[PDB]
Amino acid sequence: SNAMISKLSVNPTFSPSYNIIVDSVLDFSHILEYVTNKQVLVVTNTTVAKLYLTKFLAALVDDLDVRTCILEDGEQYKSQQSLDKILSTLLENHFTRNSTVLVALGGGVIGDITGFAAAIYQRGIDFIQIPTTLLSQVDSSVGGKTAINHQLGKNMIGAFYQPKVVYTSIEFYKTLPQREYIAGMAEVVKYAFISKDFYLWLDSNRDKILAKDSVTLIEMVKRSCQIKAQVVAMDTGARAILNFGHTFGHAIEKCQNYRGLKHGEAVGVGMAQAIDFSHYLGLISQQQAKDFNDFIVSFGISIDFPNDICQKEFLEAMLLDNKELKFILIENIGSLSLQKQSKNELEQFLDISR
Amino acid sequence: SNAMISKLSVNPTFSPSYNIIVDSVLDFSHILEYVTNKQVLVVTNTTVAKLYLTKFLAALVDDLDVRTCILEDGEQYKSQQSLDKILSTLLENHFTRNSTVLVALGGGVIGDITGFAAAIYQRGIDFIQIPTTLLSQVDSSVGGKTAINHQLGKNMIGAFYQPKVVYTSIEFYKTLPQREYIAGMAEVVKYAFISKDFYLWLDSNRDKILAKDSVTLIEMVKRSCQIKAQVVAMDTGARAILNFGHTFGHAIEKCQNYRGLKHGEAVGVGMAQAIDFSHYLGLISQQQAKDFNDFIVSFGISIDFPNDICQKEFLEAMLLDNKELKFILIENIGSLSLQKQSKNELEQFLDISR
Ligand SMILES: NC(=O)c1ccc[n+]([C@@H]2O[C@H](COP(=O)([O-])OP(=O)(O)OC[C@H]3O[C@@H](n4cnc5c(N)ncnc54)[C@H](O)[C@@H]3O)[C@@H](O)[C@H]2O)c1
Ligand SMILES: NC(=O)c1ccc[n+]([C@@H]2O[C@H](COP(=O)([O-])OP(=O)(O)OC[C@H]3O[C@@H](n4cnc5c(N)ncnc54)[C@H](O)[C@@H]3O)[C@@H](O)[C@H]2O)c1
Ligand SMILES: [Cl-]
Ligand SMILES: [Cl-]
């Protein structure tokens, strides 16, 4: 009835609009409009299932044809093998193209695979997202990227597929581990470097954000989503800025074998590097770099570069992406650029690092 | 230089236009414009490879980064297993999202899997079709359907993906088995039931078509493609008519385990059934039905219903598609309709059949 909620209309230029709902309580009924008289398959992992599945099923339980596919927890399971489980469940239970809906209940991993499945099953069926991690709330909810991993590369197979609705709740943070939360906070901070307005907003509401004030967190999520929506709306060209800090981030994950820092933790460290590298190239002053890194730390995000990564391998990891060597660099808050830079510059910059 | 060719612009409403090139000679250079300075992977099966691969590679051979993936011949190989071979080849050889092109050199099976691979590899890369069968020339070249089979269902996983160009040659018929050719001719005839103009054209050029006059065959292919292009342009709603005779067709294939009649042969028999069923329902007169079936036979297509299919299983095969029981029925040449019909009607109609 009278519970703080927030809706944000996202309107893809090549698809019908949908809205991202962010609420203070956990009330899965906000999605019944897209689940009625439909064959529903919920995809989750063991953990999210343990915590939310029986509550979710209970929020429907209206004699509706509902099935579940519980994948294993982990990035390794965003695989073809898991995709086949989702696809067999759909085929074994004769889920038609017309009244089928996949519901992705979980974090980014579940969101990617479920979205991809929905994109290919009979060349596309309704897809509903329920991001249960901060990172997936502010990053998966907009853009339409869906994908799965291959032994030879992560996120190499996928599709652009929009959801019918995105329902999420700040209540999910009550069960989300501190590291996972902070990892997602790195994505939020990224939007602050993209948008000067957001930067000022976060800087003013830090106290409430850290104290987890419901009204504030809801708006924080909403504004992050608006920024990504506005960036993709520019079409994919100047959209590259969303990769601020990912070049260094992806390389950290590759060097640790994706068993060190979480994805979001790597982005945090990566942004700190893009900043320092931006200064090295003379794009920002030392003061600006100190201020920017301070800001990341300001929100509990760690910017320390992992001790177990060698310079040799780290440099090699960044060159694999002959082609040209492009980075997302900062010139000012709200001013990021896709910038081509030599291997020498990169190598010389990493010497200060060791 | 001076060789009869035919281009037909197809303009998908949700994608850039492309054109279907149909020529009298085999000259693969008509595609160099979409292969220059690109990493090229050619997908084919053992047979098409045997006959055309070394000619194809020789038509490029300009120090270009070209690779091949030779799948096994057969519908059974339009599988995830084959899709993985195409995907590993792309990843092992570091084919980027930006200068990659998949070339589907073969018939419909190769066209579907290659198109699907191109649709998902890094969420979409350039796709080029070289249909080597009559059926794939007039059916795969328009519409954008790509798919792969699953043990639990044929063409259940796929994507809508348009090509950059479609190059084909009537020269391919010189190596194409009579049955395969005739099977493709069933698809051409289908367009005659869809379009009264085409019907009249085929009826006038039968002699030349059967005698394989180059100028005539080229136009036949061109006009078939125009019809499908015009049908999909109506958007997917009234587009169902393209399934004229497929309801019965798919059922024949299911009963024979896809080891009896070829796909196109089944469509031929299927159309003959849709016609007889249309008469049974009182939509067309007996004379019309006799005329329509005569016309199919007119082009060397067989309309005999397979002797090895039991009524029991055949009826069961058609009900699997509770939902409603819809057929594409004829009311006149150029007048097909998606028509809902009872199980009783269907069963009663099949009694005349045995
Ligand atoms: N396609 C996109 O737009 C996009 C954008 C960003 C990230 N991603 C993808 O997202 C993935 C990582 O995202 P992520 O940070 O959600 O990681 P994740 O999906 O692996 O989730 C991390 C962990 O948190 C658990 N978890 C999730 N929600 C929880 C909750 N409410 N309470 C307790 N535990 C919970 C999961 O079981 C898992 O162990 C990456 O694979 C990345 O490729 C996709
Ligand atoms: N997506 C679409 O728009 C669409 C439309 C119609 C059919 N299809 C698909 O196409 C498939 C069947 O099409 P098809 O009739 O091309 O069958 P096919 O692709 O299996 O080819 C039939 C046989 O002909 C051989 N062959 C092909 N070209 C040849 C040539 N020039 N000379 C000698 N041999 C040759 C092949 O090796 C194969 O044995 C079905 O799986 C169907 O799903 C797709
Ligand atoms: Cl970067
Ligand atoms: Cl039919």
Q: At B309, which CATH number? A: 1.20.1090.10
Q: Of A153, A175, A197, which residue sits at a domain end?
A: A175
Q: Of A175, A203, A230, which residue sits at a domain end?
A: A175
SS3 percent helix, strand, coil of chain A, rounded to 5, is 50, 20, 30
B132 is in an annotated binding site: yes
Q: How many domains, in total, are found in chain A? A: 2
Shared domain check, B156 and B227: no
Largest CA distance in chain B: 64
Strands B165-169 and B326-332: unpaired
Shared domain check, B253 and B123: no
Q: Are A178 and A300 in contact (CB under 8 A)?
A: no
Identify any residues that bridge with B67 across adjacent strands, giving them in sequence order.
B41
Shared domain check, B310 and B183: yes
Whether ligand 2 lies within 6 angstroms of the CB of B175 is answered as: yes
Buried b (16+ CB within 10 A) or exposed e, A248-281: bbbbbbbbeebeebbbbbbbbbbbbbbbbbbbbe
Cα torsion for A181, A185, A188, A194, to the nearest 10°? -150
Residue A140: alpha-carbon gap to chain centroid: 4
Provide the phi-psi class of A212: left if phi over 0, else alpha when psi is between -120 and 50, else beta: left
Shared domain check, B112 and B200: no
Ligand 1 binding residues, C-beta < 6 A: A 45, 47-48, 51, 73, 75, 78, 106-110, 112, 132-133, 135-136, 139-140, 143, 145, 155, 172, 175-176, 180, 183, 263-264
Q: Are A27 and A89 in contact (CB under 8 A)?
A: no
Q: Positive or negative CA dihedral for B240, B241, B243, B248?
A: positive
Note whether B159 contacts A122, CB cutoff 8 Å: no
Q: Which helix (H) or strand (E) holds B327?
A: strand B326-332
How many angstroms does the Cα of residue A248 sit away from the middle of ligand 3?
Answer: 6
Shared domain check, B129 and B257: no
Shared domain check, A255 and A131: no
Q: What is the DSSP letter of A238?
A: G
Amino acid of residue B99: S
Shared domain check, A312 and A197: yes
For A118, the closest chain B residue by CA position comes to B157
Q: Of the candidates B208, B85, B104, which has an alpha carbon nearest to the alpha carbon of residue B146?
A: B104
The CA distance from A123 to B144, in Å, is: 11
Shared domain check, A352 and A241: yes
Residue B66: alpha-carbon gap to chain centroid: 27
Shared domain check, B199 and B166: no
How many angstroms does the Cα of residue B255 sit away from the middle of ligand 2?
Answer: 20
- CB neighbour list of residue A174: distance below 8 Å, 6 or more residues apart: none
| The two three-digit tokens of residue A90, written as one number | 């759909």
Shared domain check, A200 and A132: no
- The nearest CA of chain A is from the CA of B339 a distance in Å of 18
B268 is in an annotated binding site: no
The CA distance from B145 to B311, in Å, is: 32
- Other C-beta atoms closer than 10 Å to the C-beta of B319 total 13
DSSP symbols for A59-98: HH-SS--EEEEEEPSSGGGSSHHHHHHHHHHHHHTT--ST
**Structural domain containing residue B6:** 1-175
| The two three-digit tokens of residue A17, written as one number | 């609009």
Task: Give the resolution value in Å.
Answer: 3.0
Shared domain check, B161 and B47: yes
- CB neighbour list of residue A161: distance below 8 Å, 6 or more residues apart: A115, A116, A118, A119, A124, A127, A144, A146
Q: Of the candidates A145, A75, A162, which has an alpha carbon nearest to the alpha carbon of residue A110?
A: A75
**Elucidation method:** X-ray
Q: Of B121, B155, B175, which residue sits at a domain end?
A: B175
Buried b (16+ CB within 10 A) or exposed e, B101-133: bbbbbbbbbbbbbbbbbbbbbbbbbbbbbbbbb
Q: Check which CATH number belongs to the domain holding B57 and give it.
A: 3.40.50.1970
> What is the position in ligand 1's atom list of the atom closest to the CA of A262?
15
- CB neighbour list of residue A171: distance below 8 Å, 6 or more residues apart: A24, A25, A26
DSSP symbols for B85-147: HHHHHHHHTT--STTEEEEEEESHHHHHHHHHHHHHBTT--EEEEEE-SHHHHHHTTSS-EEE
- The nearest CA of chain B is from the CA of A157 a distance in Å of 5
A321 is in an annotated binding site: no
The CA distance from B201 to B211, in Å, is: 16
- CB neighbour list of residue A77: distance below 8 Å, 6 or more residues apart: A45, A71, A109
Shared domain check, A168 and A298: no
Roughly how many angstroms between the first and final C-alpha of chain B, as a whole number? 57
The CA distance from B188 to B175, in Å, is: 19
